Structure formats: C-alpha cells, structure tokens
Design a protein around this ligand. Structure first.
Ligand code: HEM
Ligand code: HEM
Ligand SMILES: N=C(Nc1cccc(CNCCc2ccc(-c3ccccc3)cc2CN)c1)c1cccs1
Ligand SMILES: N=C(Nc1cccc(CNCCc2ccc(-c3ccccc3)cc2CN)c1)c1cccs1
Ligand SMILES: C[C@H](O)[C@H](O)[C@H]1CNc2nc(N)[nH]c(=O)c2N1
Ligand SMILES: C[C@H](O)[C@H](O)[C@H]1CNc2nc(N)[nH]c(=O)c2N1
Ligand SMILES: [Zn+2]
Lengths: 410, 410
C-alpha cells in the first residue's frame, strides 16, 4: 500500500502513495501485464457529481482552501447545476488547473517537468468550424513563438449529448500528407494516407509531393467537418542538415517545428473535451528515429546508409544503427542552428528523472509508462531505462478517442 | 478471455489463449502496472501434488499420451511418493521437458526460438562442491564447443528441507572481478565488487586487474561454499577489435564468450532446483551496451568517444550514441572473426517475432516482457519494439532467488 520504485543506476528508492488516488484501470490484472499494449481498454448525471466532487476536492486542496466555504458553495453550485442540466461548466481557473494536471498525469509524456508552464486557450465559446480555425491558428502562432516554442492547449466546448462533439480530425495540427503511388509505393507520410484521402474526399486539392502540410478538418457542434489551410507563414519548418556530412542537404529532408496533438480527449471533472489540441516541442528522436526511420513512416535508413557508404550486406554491420545516430545528430543540429526549440533524448530523460523526484517528494508519486518514456534509441545510456516506474491512471487526463470518421453520424 | 496482441509495423494480430493456463501472479493489478519493476513479488506436501499433477498433465499431453495408463500410473506413483517423502523425483525425460519449458516460458528471454535445442545435464547425483566443480567444468567445455556455442543447463539436486540447498554463489559461471581502488574508483567490473570480496573472504588470492575471471563459489547440500578456479583453457575469451578503427585494440577490451547464468532457481512440477546454471550465447548488446557502457559497469563511453575525437561538450552532439554504435560493431566483428557464436540485436529480435508467431500458432501464445525483450539500443528500428506482448507467468519457470550469502545459516 506504499510501493517502492528503484533506480538501478543510482540505487535511489522512491515511495509511491499517489497510486492510491488512482481511479481508472490499467488493463493489467494479477495474472497478465498489458504494459506493452498500445491502446488499453454518453455520460449520465448519476455518475457526474462523484467525478466533479473528486476534481473539485483536488482543485480546492491545491489552492489551500480544501473544505472552506468557497469550496462547499462551489460543490453545491456544481451539484445544483448538474441537477438542472445534467452537466456543468468549469471556472476558467478550474479549466486551467485541470488541463495542467491532465498533462501532469500523462504517464507516457517524458516532457512533464514543464507541466505547470502550460498556456491554456479557452475556446469554449467557439460555435463553428471557422471559429475553430481561427482559434487553432492563434494557437499555432502563439505556441511557435518564432521558434522559441511555448507549450499550449486550446480547449473547445465540452461534449454534451454526444452527437454535438467538437473534433479536430487531424491527428496533429501540422502533419505532412501521404499518397500511394501508381507503383504502390508511398509519397510523403504513409501514416496519414487515409486522412490525406479523407481531405481529398471532402475536397482537398493536393500538391502530391512529400512534405505537403495537410489542411485542417474541423468539426463543430457535431456538424460535418470543413477544410481549412493554415497560413503557410504560421507553419515553421526546419531544413535538416548535418554538421559534418554536406550531402545530408541533398537528402532534402525537412520537418515542422511544432508538434501539436489534436486527436485526444481531455477529461476534467467528468467533463469531456473531445477537441483539445495541445503542443509542446519535439524530442529529437520523435523525428529522427520514429518519423524518419520507422519502416511504416518515411523509412529513410536505406538512403542515409547508402550516402554514408556503409556495409549494408550484413545485418550485423549495424549499418542501420550507425545511420540512425547520424540522422538524429542532423535533426538536433538543424533545429538548434535555427533557434527552434528541441530537446535531445539525454536532456529530456534526465529532466524526467528530476521531475520524478519532485513528484514523489511533493505529490507522493508520478505515474510513468516505461514503455513510452524510454527513447526509441540509446535506451540504456539514458537514465530512465534504469528507472523503475509505476504506471497508473490519475485524473484529469488525456484519453485516446475513436477517429471521428469511424463514429460520426455523417 | 481471448486476448489480442498487435504488431504496429506489420498490422499482424495474434490471439493469446495461453495466458489462461497462467498460474503465478505478475505484480500488476487492475489499478497499477508494474511491468518495469525489475523484481516483482520451504514447501509442503499439501501444495505439492497439485503442482506435480499440473506438470505431469502437461508432460503427458506433450507426448500424445494425456490420460493414458502410463500417465495415470505416473500420477499415482508421484502421489504415493509425495505421500511417503513429502517430495518426489522427476524422470530424466520429465527433467529435460521441464528445463526446456522453463526456458520456453522465460518471458524476458529474446533467445527462445532455440528453446527446444537445450542440452540438459543431469547433476542430481552430485553430493559435494568438488562434484559441482566437475559438473560445471564439463558444462563450460560442452557449451563453449570451441566457439560453436551450444545451449546447455546443468541441474543439481532439488531443494529438500531448505537448509540443504545446492547453490552456485556466482551470478554467472564466468564473470570478471571487481575491486575498489584506493582512490575510490573501481577496477574490473563494479557489479561484482561484493562477490569479489566474498571470494577474498573465503580465501581467494586476487590478481587485482581488470578482466580477472572470478573463481567458483559452490555450496553443496547446504554446507559452506568452496572456491574453485575454472581451468583457464576452458574460458574462451574474445579480444575486442574494430574492423575500421585500429586504436580500438589499444582500448584493450576483451569479454568471455560464454554467458552462463548460475544464480536462478528452476521450478519444475513444484520441485525447486536452486542450482541450475544455464548458458546460451550472447546477444551483442549485452556486452557492447550494458556491460561496457552502463554507468555502473565498465562505463567506457568516455574513452571511446575520446579516441573518436567526438564533440563531448554538448549532450546534444549525441557523442554517446555515436560511440555506443561503434562499440557494438566492434563486439560483433570481434566475435564473428573468431568464429565465436554471437547474435546481433536485429537478427535476434527478428527471430523472436518469428518465434512468437510459432508459439501463438502451435501453443496459443508466448509470454513476453517487452521491457526486457526490446534491446537496450536501437529500440524502434528492431521489430519487437513495434510488437505488443502479453506478459504472464507459466510454469516450469526460472525464478530469481535471494543471494546465498543473505540467507545461508553459515
Ligand atoms: C513541452 C515539451 C514536451 C515534450 C518534450 C514532450 C515529450 C513527449 C514525447 C516524446 C511523447 C511520446 C510521443 C510519441 O512517442 O508519440 C509524449 C507523449 C505525450 N505527451 Fe508530451 N511532451 C511535451 C509537451 C506536452 C504537453 C504540453 C502536453 C499536454 C498538454 C503533453 C501530453 C502528452 C500526452 C498525453 C502524451 C501521451 C500520448 C499518447 O499516449 O499517444 N505533452 N510527450
Ligand atoms: C541461446 C541463446 C540465448 C540468447 C541469445 C538469449 C538472450 C537473452 C537476453 C539478451 C536476455 C536478457 C538478459 C539480460 O539483459 O540480462 C535473456 C534473458 C533470459 N534468458 Fe535467454 N538467451 C539465450 C539462451 C537462454 C537459455 C539456454 C536459457 C535457459 C535454459 C535462457 C533463459 C533466460 C532467462 C530465464 C532470462 C531472464 C533473466 C532475468 O530475468 O534476469 N536463455 N536472454
Ligand atoms: N513532442 C510531442 N510529441 C507527441 C506527444 C504526444 C503524442 C504524440 C503522438 N502520439 C501518437 C502515437 C501514435 C498513435 C497512433 C498510431 C497509429 C494509430 C493507428 C494506426 C497506426 C498507428 C501511431 C502512433 C505512433 N506510431 C506526439 C508533442 C506534441 C504535442 C505536445 S508534445
Ligand atoms: N545471453 C545471455 N544473457 C543472459 C541471460 C539471462 C540472464 C542474464 C543476466 N541477467 C541479470 C540481469 C541483472 C540482474 C541483477 C542485477 C542487479 C542485482 C542487484 C544489484 C544490482 C544489479 C543487474 C542485472 C543487469 N543490470 C544474461 C545468457 C546467459 C545464459 C544463457 S543466455
Ligand atoms: C507495441 C508497443 O507498445 C508500441 O510500439 C509502443 C512502444 N513504445 C512507444 N513509445 C513511444 N514514445 N511512442 C510509441 O509510439 C511507442 N510505441
Ligand atoms: C528499471 C528497468 O526495469 C530495468 O532497467 C530493466 C529494463 N530492461 C532490461 N532489459 C534487459 N534485457 N536487461 C535488463 O537488465 C533490463 N533492465
Ligand atoms: Zn502491467
């Protein structure tokens, strides 16, 4: 009931009591661990007030006013508001608190040392896709900050009956298109080929190239979604060069500076925000390892190893590993030389350990998903590899949700 | 009750029903996943026959004679033998079956495609530490096979009352010593500094250098353990050179060819074999990444990056990643050029996926520990990174056990 986590590189032991406040379930049981399963698995008023009370208790605790009169009146105000409408509305303060803590609770996020430096854009007054576009543009502009990236979240109206959901159909605000070729191969990003076609179906005119920034597909109040093109001046892009290899330019790679997830669901006090695009900055490996080198993504290890003139006959020459490291030095160098915020996996993972120590100290724990926290290369030469982590579900939280096209009464 | 695991690089889905035969518990609950905890947590006759029956049922099932007369008579023979002595003895056939399946069930072992090619040395007639030494030497000689390594396990008498355990006090049959220096630094292997001292306490005369192969500390029938020096001619060693960098020789690194774990407990049919050294061959990264580059092991990344003349000022130059890849090419090249069996993490992890497909097909599943199966470098450019795995505990099994010195009535 007071669980211990050890770091096997420092012999440091932290004690977790925060997992006692855990509410949702993990997918694991006493007899099966599902910690490597990628995805593990309308509301009513009878369930809502417990969720609202729990959240309001932690909100008022966090401002040194747990159990005060203002707390009780808010509790009663929300209870009575749930009585009337079978839902309720968060204060601006509660909304900002909840969003920050959904990030704080994201066990898969190695970047949480920054969790309290989060800029919350309240878009709950939005009514139309055009409003969404506007709000999203201002998010991109603010978050990008001329390369001095700033963490931000934009929060559209909460789910009501379910058939009036706000949704951003893009998986990220900024992603590159993906088209299948006549010869079956893929140009651009294979991950987005279905979404790229959905935009063509709703009317996108595609410049069938590699790094074509997709338009936005914005659904407002459950209506059919609508296409919008982010102004190109708002899309900061980094050309990828290597500090040593000059042919690396000829590779002609570029990536966007702003990672901004837009397909997740923000849960606060039992309220569901189905459209809550949030952005930070990149860890290098997301681009250099996963985006560029996943076999189902840009899959460039072939080309880079060629230009390096590596022994590609044998798997055991580690030509793949050697090219992988060169690519990630190139992503980092290119972003830093452009003053565009980025963090290498060593800096990021060290900060997460430090963040973990803070959370165990001032909060009694830190939910953490080792499978996701350990970078996709150089695992054990980063300190998180050696860090036991307890994974558990705390709320407020970011949740996955079905893709909108699979569910939307169209 | 019929769980699905997906590979997110191939879109391949396998169905696991084998987890239903799972017996022991994982450490995880519905509310907390402990999949990154490194260690998760005398017998009686009233518990033994269930364990014996379960095992004998699976043994006789596996030879197409489940429920036959020979099965029932063995079941009755073992029941009556447990009645008399409150324990029982395995047939040679059952012992070999159990050991192979303890390996087959080792969810942390990426090497299980080989699980049925296991050479079982029955040492249950051993009575003394000298017998153990002899048996262990023959294991080393056979397994090493002039570099054409062969998987083997040597199985000493099962635990009886508990105070007559056979134990190999070494964590591996072959490991390098570790001594702390006058200036506090460590020479050799920091992992073994406590064990190295224990040998000095029991009488080892140490050649205080780096790669000094430790003696054996063998405990027989619960008596005090005794030191033995493996004949050096039996300890195959590989000098580490690089196919490109000639200074890599000046690094003066060498490792032993035979990885042979000796501190684990083999559980078969509820019987406990506390001394069961088993050996295979190395995956390159065990040496090149963990042994050489863990900060708490040989910690050589410093030196290698120096000789490579790498930018070590910035963490973000990835000098560590770049030196790490060079080291692992050197370990692989050096072993292969010496015809000493080794497998690179690409070959090994590909074979494990293939092994997984076999087990789901012909067995309904394959227990697998993603945290341990994914190599410590180049994670996502190997196929296991993308492979959902269910972890669960099947028996026969290899279990951790306390270090003998912490428990032994001395
Ligand atoms: C500020 C810099 C940030 C960094 C360096 C960072 C880093 C990361 C990385 C590398 C991942 C793994 C993503 C993947 O592999 O696909 C991740 C996951 C995640 N991040 Fe962060 N992040 C940052 C900011 C944020 C912010 C501002 C939020 C929310 C407000 C957030 C919420 C999450 C969530 C919910 C996940 C889990 C995604 C999933 O399960 O698919 N992060 N983070
Ligand atoms: C034949 C070649 C083999 C290869 C390439 C291989 C590979 C590996 C590797 C890389 C690990 C992780 C070890 C670590 O990181 O410390 C491991 C773990 C393990 N292996 Fe294998 N192995 C082989 C043979 C065997 C054999 C013959 C057995 C038993 C008869 C075995 C049983 C185990 C067990 C029980 C573990 C888990 C150890 C733990 O939890 O600490 N392996 N294997
Ligand atoms: N720095 C960042 N990064 C980051 C953070 C959170 C989440 C993500 C993206 N998380 C997506 C992982 C994912 C999800 C689904 C599928 C998938 C779904 C259906 C079919 C096939 C694949 C594949 C992947 C990645 N392979 C990136 C930030 C972006 C915004 C703030 S921080
Ligand atoms: N190819 C091989 N390899 C392999 C396979 C199985 C197990 C192992 C060694 N598994 C040890 C992992 C471990 C355990 C304990 C501690 C530890 C304990 C107390 C204090 C500090 C550390 C540290 C580590 C590694 N960091 C290697 C083979 C050897 C034999 C057959 S196959
Ligand atoms: C099967 C496995 O869960 C899947 O590949 C996970 C592994 N860890 C990951 N970790 C991060 N950060 N991002 C990912 O997409 C994944 N993928
Ligand atoms: C904390 C964490 O569980 C620990 O570092 C694990 C991670 N995965 C591992 N995987 C292997 N193969 N060997 C290890 O020693 C470890 N260490
Ligand atoms: Zn688990």
């Amino acid at each position: 009931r007071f669980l211990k986590v050890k770091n096997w590189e420092t012999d440091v032991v932290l004690t977790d009591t925060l997992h006692l406040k855990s509410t949702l379930e993990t997918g694991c049981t006493e007899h099966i661990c599902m910690g490597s399963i990628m995805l593990p698995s309308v509301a009513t008023k009878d369930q809502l007030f417990p969720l609202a009370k729990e959240f309001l208790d932690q909100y008022y605790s966090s401002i040194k006013r747990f159990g005060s009169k203002a707390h009780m009146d808010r509790l009663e105000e929300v209870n009575k508001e749930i009585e009337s409408t079978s839902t309720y509305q968060l204060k601006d303060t509660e909304l900002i608190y909840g969003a920050k803590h959904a990030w704080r609770n994201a066990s898969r996020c190695v970047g949480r040392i920054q969790w309290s430096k989060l800029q919350v854009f309240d878009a709950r007054d939005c009514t139309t896709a055009h409003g969404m576009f506007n709000y999203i543009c201002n998010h991109v502009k603010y978050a990008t900050n001329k390369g001095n990236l700033r963490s931000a979240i934009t929060i559209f109206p909460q789910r009501t009956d379910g058939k009036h959901d706000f949704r951003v159909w893009n998986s990220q605000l900024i992603r590159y298109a993906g088209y299948k070729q006549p010869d079956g191969s893929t140009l651009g990003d294979p991950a987005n080929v279905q979404f790229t076609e959905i935009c063509i179906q709703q009317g996108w005119k595609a410049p069938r190239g590699r790094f074509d920034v997709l338009p936005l597909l914005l659904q407002a109040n459950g209506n059919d979604p609508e296409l919008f093109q982010i102004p190109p001046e708002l899309v900061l892009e980094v050309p990828i060069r290597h500090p040593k290899f000059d042919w690396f330019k000829d590779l002609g790679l570029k990536w966007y500076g702003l990672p901004a997830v837009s397909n997740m669901l923000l849960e606060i006090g039992g309220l569901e925000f189905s459209a809550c695009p949030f952005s930070g900055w990149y860890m290098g490996t997301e681009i250099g390892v996963r985006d560029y080198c996943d076999n189902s993504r840009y899959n460039i290890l072939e080309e880079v190893a060629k230009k390096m003139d590596l022994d590609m006959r044998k798997t055991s020459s580690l030509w793949k590993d050697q090219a992988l490291v060169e690519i990630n030095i190139a992503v980092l160098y290119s972003f830093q030389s452009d003053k565009v915020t980025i963090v290498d996996h060593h800096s990021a993972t060290e900060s997460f350990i430090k963040h973990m120590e803070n959370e165990y100290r001032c909060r009694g724990g830190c939910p953490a998903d080792w499978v996701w926290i350990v970078p996709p290369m150089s695992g054990s030469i980063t300190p998180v590899f050696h860090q036991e982590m307890l994974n558990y579900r705390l709320t407020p939280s970011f949740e996955y949700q079905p893709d909108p096209w699979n569910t939307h009464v169209w």
